[PDB]
Each structure stands twice: as C-alpha cells, then as structure tokens.
C-alpha cells in the first residue's frame, strides 16, 4: 500500500480538486504539512486499506512515511472526498480500528430474519510495530433471540481492548 504524495504550498484547494487532486494534510506530535494526492490512485488504495491498514506516502524528496488515515471529509452533494487527514505513525502506541471476520452465517433463518454487522470493526490500542491484520469472531448459534457484546474475542499479542468492553457487536433481527 503506497501512494505518491506531493507537497502543497498554497494553491487554492478548489483548483487542485478541479484538477483531480485531493487536498490534505499530514501530522503527528512532530510534523505538520500541507500535502495533496491524486484522487483515483488514493481511492484504489483506500478502497481496501481504509483506516484499518497502513499506507506509505512517497513525498517528492524520495522519503516514504508510514501513515494511517484519521479523516475523510466529503461533499454531501457529489458524494466525493473533499480532503484527507493523514496521521504519520512512529513507535508510540496509537489507537485505531481493526477489521473482523464474520465467519459462516447465523442460525436465525425460519422467521425470515437477517444478520446485522453492528460492528464490522473494533477500537484497539496497538503499537505501530505490532499492528494485526484482523480479528477472528465465532458466529454460528446466533438465533432470532440472543446476541453477543463484550470481550468475547480472540485478543492476540500487542492488543488492548479500548472499548467498554460491554457493548453490542452483532445481532440477528426480524424481517422487512
């Protein structure tokens, strides 16, 4: 996951947008810089990476910064990204979301019901040098009655549950 970034000086964002570029910024306790990326290339990436997976930004001085996304502001009308926030990581432990694996399908089928991925992902504290790929769930006996919430998870090394942990994650519910 790599993206050619560029350095934004003070060119009206409008004009950059107009020209298929995507204005933005990068920051961390230490650096703060106006940047821009190209749209279609960023989307190609973000469409998978998103906020779950690191992106490496290639600036015009050859340097390659390891970053996470923290924000995608978008124009309600013409639902497109107006501006991207990039957080450049280092080594201090940083909070983020990590995707889940909804294995199989739930047993609530006779009453017409349908699964609700209330949490596709969960908030966790992690070091930048111990970032997991995913987390593994266990859905099978999720009937029209019962559900699951809290620290019912397979937490690997480097991970710290930064949620309640008492909070609903996926519930099967009646049809429309």
């Amino acid at each position: 996951y790599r993206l050619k970034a560029y350095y934004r000086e003070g060119e009206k964002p409008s004009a950059l947008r107009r020209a298929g570029k995507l204005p933005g910024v990068m920051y961390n306790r230490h650096l703060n810089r106006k940047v821009y990326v190209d749209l279609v290339e960023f989307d190609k990436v973000f469409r998978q990476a998103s906020i779950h997976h690191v992106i490496v930004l290639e600036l015009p001085d050859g340097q390659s910064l390891p970053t996470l996304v923290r924000q995608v502001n978008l124009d309600k009308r013409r639902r497109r990204p107006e501006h991207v926030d990039f957080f450049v990581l280092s080594d201090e432990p940083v909070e983020m979301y990590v995707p889940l694996r909804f294995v199989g399908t739930p047993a609530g089928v006779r009453a017409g019901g349908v699964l609700q991925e209330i949490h596709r992902d969960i908030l966790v504290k992690v070091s930048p040098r111990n970032i997991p790929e995913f987390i593994e769930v266990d859905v099978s006996g999720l009937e029209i009655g019962d559900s699951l919430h809290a620290s019912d998870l397979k937490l690997p090394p480097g991970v710290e549950l930064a949620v309640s942990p008492e909070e609903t994650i996926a519930a099967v519910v009646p049809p429309e």
């Binding site: 989307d43 973000f46 469409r47 998103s50 906020i51 996470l68 923290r70 924000q71 995608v72 978008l74 639902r79 990204p81 909070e95 983020m96 979301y97 596709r120 992902d121 908030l123």
Partner: peptide, 11 residues
C-alpha cells in the same frame, strides 16, 4: 443508489 465506500468515519 449507494454502496458502502469511504463512509466509515472512524480512525
């Protein structure tokens, strides 16, 4: 009609 793009305002 819409899908589920970068509509995931998280961190």
């Amino acid at each position: 009609i819409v899908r589920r793009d970068a509509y995931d305002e998280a961190q």
